[PDB]
Amino acid sequence: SGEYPTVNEIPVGEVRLYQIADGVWSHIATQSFDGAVYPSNGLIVRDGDELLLIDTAWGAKNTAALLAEIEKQIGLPVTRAVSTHFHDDRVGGVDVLRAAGVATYASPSTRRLAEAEGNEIPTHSLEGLSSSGDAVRFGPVELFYPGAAHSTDNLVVYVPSANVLYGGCAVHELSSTSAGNVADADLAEWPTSVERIQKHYPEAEVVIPGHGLPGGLDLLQHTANVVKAHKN
């Protein structure tokens, strides 16, 4: 009924949308992994009379439900999707997207990691993102590679028309007390990568983490703090 939806409010399999700004929504879904249930976020950005999707809804059935929710709530076709790293909360559902006519994209790094781990593989490679600090335009967003953090391939997304920073899994919510799933992380580089985000996007007004509640720029400093303490 208006607040940002939380893990216990979303049954696994359904998707909620949350209006972030004009032409910008987050999508929220839940999934089971290793016997626990987790929420996860993605982004939808209006691109004229089409939509750009950032990240799947963490699985094939969730991603089908995402498409149905977009049709109900927004009613514009999703034409392109970008996955921000290779884990299943970002690429799981790419095969559903590809069968619904969505062109799927990811960096070459993400595509290689997805293939090696047996996850779904976006069709198209995003060049121009291989060095930390690189940025490219993709429709109504900028894609930015901050360096290794949550994963070596993680991308962040900025919506310049709205000053919305989608940090993906490189950014944690303010309530986080640990650095999430660190299986493929670089805890030593992560603060430096967050510092690159802070320097590149100082006018961000909303910051969206990969999991949990949006806030403002404080999410970035909080992330650096929880990662430094996890490393210790």
Ligand X SMILES: C[C@@H](c1cccc2c(-c3ccc(CS(C)(=O)=O)c(F)c3)c(C(=O)O)[nH]c12)N1CC(CNC(=O)CN)OC1=O
Catalytic residues: 85, 87, 89, 150, 181
Smallest separation (angstroms) from ligand X to the CB of 150: 6
Contact mark string toward ligand X, 123..162, x via CB under 6 A: ---------------------------x------------
H helix and E strand count, the chain:
6, 12
- 169: contact with Zn ion by CB under 5 A: yes
* Contact pick of 42, 146, 210, 215 for Zn ion (by CB under 5 A): 210
∠ CA 110-116-119, nearest 5°, is: 70
Residue of 184, 187, 191, 200 interacting with ligand X (CB under 6 A): 184
Is 222 annotated in some ligand binding site? no
Lateral strand order in the sheet of 164-168: 135-138, 141-144, 156-159, 164-168, 206-209
Contact between 211 and 41 (Cβ < 8 Å): yes
Within a 10 A sphere around the Cβ of 137, how many other Cβ atoms?
Answer: 10
Which region among 69-77, 84-92, 186-194, 195-203 touches ligand X (by CB under 6 A)? 84-92
What is the rounded distance in angstroms from the CA atom of residue 128 to the CA atom of residue 198? 21
**Residue 186 interacts with Zn ion (CB under 5 A): yes or no:** no
Please give the residues from 85 up to 144 whose contact with Zn ion meets the rule CB under 5 A: 87, 89
- Sorted by sequence, the CB contacts under 8 Å of residue 166 that are 6+ apart come out as 41, 43, 54, 84, 156, 157, 158, 159, 208
* Beta carbon of residue 11, minimum distance to ligand X (angstroms, whole number): 17
Q: Which amino acid makes up residue 117? A: E
Write down the least CB distance from residue 192 to ligand X, Å: 18
Binds 212, which of Zn ion, ligand X, none (CB < 5 to 8 A, cut-off by type)?
A: ligand X
Q: How far is the CB of 38 from ligand X (least distance, A)?
A: 5
Indicate the angle between helix axes 190-200 and 218-231, nearest 10 degrees.
170
Give the binding site for ligand X (CB under 6 A): 33, 38, 87-89, 117, 150, 169, 172, 176-178, 180-181, 183-184, 210-212
